[PDB]
Design a protein around this nucleic acid. Structure first.
Ligand SMILES: [Cl-]
Ligand SMILES: [Cl-]
Ligand SMILES: [Mg+2]
Ligand SMILES: [Mg+2]
Ligand SMILES: [Mg+2]
Ligand SMILES: [Mg+2]
Ligand SMILES: [Mg+2]
Ligand SMILES: [Mg+2]
Ligand SMILES: [Mg+2]
Ligand SMILES: [Mg+2]
Ligand SMILES: [Mg+2]
Ligand SMILES: [Mg+2]
Ligand SMILES: [Mg+2]
Ligand SMILES: [Mg+2]
Ligand SMILES: [Mg+2]
Ligand SMILES: [Mg+2]
Ligand SMILES: [Mg+2]
Ligand SMILES: [Mg+2]
Ligand SMILES: [Mg+2]
Ligand SMILES: [Mg+2]
Ligand SMILES: [Mg+2]
Ligand SMILES: [Mg+2]
Ligand code: NA
Ligand code: NA
Ligand code: NA
Ligand code: NA
Ligand code: NA
Ligand code: NA
Ligand code: NA
Ligand code: NA
Ligand code: NA
Ligand code: NA
Lengths: 143, 81, 82, 56, 46
RNA sequence: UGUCCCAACGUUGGGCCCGGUGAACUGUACAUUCCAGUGCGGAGUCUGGAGACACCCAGGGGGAAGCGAAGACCCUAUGGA
RNA sequence: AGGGAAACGUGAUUCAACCUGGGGCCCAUGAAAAGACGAGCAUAGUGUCCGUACCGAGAACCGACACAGGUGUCCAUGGCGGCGAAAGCCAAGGCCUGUCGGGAGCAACCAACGUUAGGGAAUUCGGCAAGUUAGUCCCGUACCUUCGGAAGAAGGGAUGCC
RNA sequence: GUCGGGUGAGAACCCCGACGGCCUAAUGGAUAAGGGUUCCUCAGCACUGCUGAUCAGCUGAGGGUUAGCCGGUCCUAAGUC
RNA sequence: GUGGAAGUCUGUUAGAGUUGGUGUCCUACAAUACCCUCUCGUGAUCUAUGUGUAGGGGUGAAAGGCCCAUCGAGUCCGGCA
């Protein structure tokens, strides 16, 4: 008995990898007799031919670690492999910062706390990298 | 002068088209267009050709898959020959 | 029928990446000898196979308890894990 | 790179083809000229007195 | 590759010329296809 | 730091035995050789002695001026480029 | 509609495809033509001809071979990992055909290789081969120099898990 | 790869199940060129297959490629006639 | 601080090359291969497909290199016994 023809068919009818298709060891004779895609679907319904289950990788251990790293752990010198600007792209980070500081100043203006001249001044000093952060900015603002 | 139809192309797969889709398969001369096959077929078997699909075969001839109108029956037209 | 402990120490004389295969052969040769039967007549239930390949092809266990029965018209032995 | 075996691999180009005129597989499809009968070059058929011995 | 209608035709002929001498010709001639061509071992023209 | 003193042990694939498959190089003939001698002055074969029961397995290659290539060097040709 | 045994979700982040903007460079200036738009709607007819199988490679191609060689394009967003299209491990998918097997603790010898005390280049034409160092962060850094560089100089410290 | 099992006159290597592995820009998926029927089915083992073969890209006979809207076709490029 | 220049650096990304091991092979897997190591890797870069240049002539960042395993003058046939 040579069921390799069937395998190929079974693989397509079940819409699975030939390697996952399963033929019951007690019906090689019947299955050996399947010749059409139909005879196959039939043998499928009787459960003689079935598709094994595909596995998936378990991200459990990966989730735990993901928590520890979001909480700040497992990121010491001995756990870094990439250069510093590799782990954090300095240009991207300056865009993050400056947009914060520019957004902040923008609010205080519309809010009224700042006069278009005070704003202007601050803005110009932000673009000049005078504030390490919005907090640093607010502080400077209060004289 | 060459004739368009050569003879009916009877094979397992030619049977299924016939029984299941009302189609007649022929071995035609390769210079024949879908048009010439259509007319030649109607005039020979007195039927209405709805569609003609062709293929230049690895046999050196041209195969033609002719579908007849629901009004005619492939199984019957082919049965008389 | 009886239960026997098979020593697989001679499987080390065979390149390590091929221990499982040699083990298997050793079992059969042990049963065929201790149950006075031809190795042809010895049948190993898959259980024994899986026990031997449990940890890969090169990490076979130094022993294996196997339960075997002997009988029939040409003489033979059927075996399995325990 | 070896001029031998390794340079033989890149040979998947088509040049000489069945000739419309003579039937020999010598119709260079890139030059559109037959190296055997001269189709595509000469109306007359390619032929030379050196294709045979001087006195024959 | 992309073949033409002419090309396809000849390949077709070649496949036909690649059959064996019918058993009845053996009998009729009281006793070999010298042009047998294998796709791998040989090479057609064009 | 096994490059060395200075070699050791181990791992894997061969090697060795078995089944199957199954080439090639090479071959004037003879041939179990060794020590001397002789010879166109570099001998398994001549001469004198010595040694030598026949067959087979593995080995590392001393010899057959071993096999492989009508010497690339040198000279000669009323040669070639 | 379809598909699914069944449920037949909703929010979010990062966002290949695709869309759309700004800037910089050239002693270098980055095709053309057909066609399309410009130029509406109904209904009907027509839309011929040629290609379409399979391989696309450690057996379907070239290399005399089922040759460890050679041979273009697309998938570059599957998971862990990490700077990464890197290593290692693992899915999906594919395979056990880089296609002869059996046996001997399996000797000498050889191929690839591990480990070797004390010494430490004594080896050798020569440190050939092998080895040492190694990722990241902080500290620190000579001569010289075309001021760019030398420079990761050197040297010193740290490095996990909870 | 191994243990079972299927088929067969004949099975280490054809097929089924389990276990054990190998490939992760490839040993996966889609293709260009080139090959030209090698594709599928059935029947086979004198040849081919680095051993064997019930298997096969082998032998024999049958069958298989369907397009207004995927390519070609049309256009023009270096350039060619 | 921003900016992101460069025949720039590291880099078996892909890809291109070929320094050493004078390793393996050397009747080969291979009439130029294998492995480890190593160079380049945004540019005078690499590559597919098309196209141009022909034998005392091409092409040559020049080695007398290359022009289908053929090059101090390709190959085929003829002169030719
Ligand atoms: Cl902008
Ligand atoms: Cl196409
Ligand atoms: Mg920056
Ligand atoms: Mg068509
Ligand atoms: Mg050459
Ligand atoms: Mg046929
Ligand atoms: Mg004597
Ligand atoms: Mg000489
Ligand atoms: Mg000289
Ligand atoms: Mg001269
Ligand atoms: Mg297809
Ligand atoms: Mg092979
Ligand atoms: Mg030591
Ligand atoms: Mg010294
Ligand atoms: Mg070194
Ligand atoms: Mg087939
Ligand atoms: Mg069969
Ligand atoms: Mg560079
Ligand atoms: Mg680099
Ligand atoms: Mg080119
Ligand atoms: Mg010179
Ligand atoms: Mg030639
Ligand atoms: Na016919
Ligand atoms: Na061929
Ligand atoms: Na060593
Ligand atoms: Na010798
Ligand atoms: Na990733
Ligand atoms: Na085999
Ligand atoms: Na600046
Ligand atoms: Na190399
Ligand atoms: Na010349
Ligand atoms: Na001559």
């Amino acid at each position: 008995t040579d069921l390799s023809a069937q395998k190929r068919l079974a693989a397509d009818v079940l819409d699975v990898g030939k390697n996952r298709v399963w033929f019951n060891p007690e019906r090689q004779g019947d299955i050996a007799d399947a010749i059409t895609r139909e005879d196959v679907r039939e043998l499928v319904d009787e459960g003689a031919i079935q598709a094994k289950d595909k596995k998936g990788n378990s991200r459990g251990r990966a989730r735990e670690r993901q928590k520890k790293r979001a909480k700040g752990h497992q990121k010491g010198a001995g756990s870094r492999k990439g250069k510093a600007g590799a782990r954090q792209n300095s240009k991207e980070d300056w865009e993050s910062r400056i947009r914060a500081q520019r957004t902040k100043l923008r609010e205080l203006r519309d809010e009224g706390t700042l006069s278009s001249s005070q704003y202007r001044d601050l803005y110009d000093k932000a673009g000049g990298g005078e504030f390490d952060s919005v907090a640093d900015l607010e502080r400077y603002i209060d004289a | 002068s060459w004739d368009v139809i050569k003879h009916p192309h009877v094979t397992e797969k030619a049977m299924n088209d016939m029984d299941f889709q009302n189609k007649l398969q022929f071995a035609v001369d390769d210079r024949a267009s879908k048009g010439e096959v259509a007319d030649a077929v109607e005039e020979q078997y007195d039927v209405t050709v709805e569609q003609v699909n062709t293929q230049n075969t690895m046999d050196g001839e041209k195969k033609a898959v002719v579908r007849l109108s629901e009004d005619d029956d492939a199984q019957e037209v082919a049965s008389r020959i | 029928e009886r239960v026997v402990t098979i020593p697989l120490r001679d499987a080390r004389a065979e390149p390590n990446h091929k221990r499982a295969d040699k083990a298997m052969i050793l079992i059969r040769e042990h049963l065929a000898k201790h149950f006075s039967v031809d190795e042809d007549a010895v049948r190993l239930d898959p259980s024994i196979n899986e026990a031997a390949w449990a940890r890969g092809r090169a990490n076979t266990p130094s022993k294996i308890r196997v339960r075997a029965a002997r009988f029939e018209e040409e003489g033979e032995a059927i075996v399995e894990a325990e | 790179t070896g001029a031998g075996t390794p340079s033989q691999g890149k040979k998947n180009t088509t040049t000489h083809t069945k000739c419309r005129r003579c039937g020999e597989k010598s119709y260079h499809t890139k030059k559109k000229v037959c190296s055997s009968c001269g189709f595509g070059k000469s109306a007359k058929r390619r032929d030379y007195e050196w294709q045979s011995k001087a006195g024959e | 590759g992309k073949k033409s209608k002419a090309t396809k035709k000849r390949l077709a002929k070649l496949d036909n010329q690649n059959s064996r001498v019918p058993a009845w010709v053996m009998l009729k001639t009281d006793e070999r296809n010298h042009k047998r061509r294998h796709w791998r071992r040989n090479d057609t023209d064009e």
